[PDB]
Amino acid sequence: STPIQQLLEHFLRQLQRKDPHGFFAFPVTDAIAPGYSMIIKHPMDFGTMKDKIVANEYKSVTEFKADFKLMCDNAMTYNRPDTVYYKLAKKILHAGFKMMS
Ligand SMILES: CCn1cc(-c2cccc(C(F)(F)F)c2)c2sc(/C(N)=N/C3CCS(=O)(=O)CC3)cc2c1=O
């Protein structure tokens, strides 16, 4: 396990603690979010991120941060602003980027 993998696994643990319901834990299904796959072109979730870290697919922190932002942006695009998902996405995007400095 490389130094970048160790750091990313660390950041990921810290980020996932901010989503105690695990709304962002696994790919969003069309069943729970109708028409999701026809709206969101590039889905992302923490489970997929973990698998990318394990596969050594991230070669910079920048790349990891981009997938995190993608996840949050997806939630903010698909959901109306008055929803728990949108509000949590906006909260964790800011907190996560700060956290990661
Ligand atoms: C943040 C990612 N995400 C996750 C979910 C989700 C995943 C697992 C379990 C649950 C549940 F058990 F709590 F329901 C929700 C959902 S569900 C959803 C959905 N059905 N959202 C609607 C909210 C009302 S609206 O904005 O009018 C249309 C979309 C969007 C997302 C999502 O982005």
Swiss-Prot record:
This is Bromodomain-containing protein 9. The chain holds residues 138 to 238 of 597 of the full protein. Binds acetylated histones H3 and H4. Binds butyrylated histone H4. Component of the multiprotein chromatin-remodeling subcomplex SWI/SNF called GBAF, which includes at least BICRA or BICRAL (mutually exclusive), BRD9, SS18, the core BAF subunits, SMARCA2/BRM, SMARCA4/BRG1/BAF190A, ACTL6A/BAF53, SMARCC1/BAF155, and SMARCD1/BAF60A. Interacts (via N-terminal bromodomain) with acetylated RAD54. Interacts (via C-terminus) with RAD51. Plays a role in chromatin remodeling and regulation of transcription. Acts as a chromatin reader that recognizes and binds acylated histones: binds histones that are acetylated and/or butyrylated. Component of SWI/SNF chromatin remodeling subcomplex GBAF that carries out key enzymatic activities, changing chromatin structure by altering DNA-histone contacts within a nucleosome in an ATP-dependent manner. Also orchestrates the RAD51-RAD54 complex formation and thereby plays a role in homologous recombination (HR). The record marks I32, Y85 as: Histone H4K5ac H4K8ac and histone H4K5bu H4K8bu binding. Residues 1-101 form the Bromo domain. Residues 77-79 are annotated as: Histone H4K5ac H4K8ac and histone H4K5bu H4K8bu binding. The Bromo domain mediates interaction with histones that have acetylated lysine residues at specific positions. Also recognizes and binds histones that are butyrylated. It comes from the Eukaryota. It is found in: Nucleus.
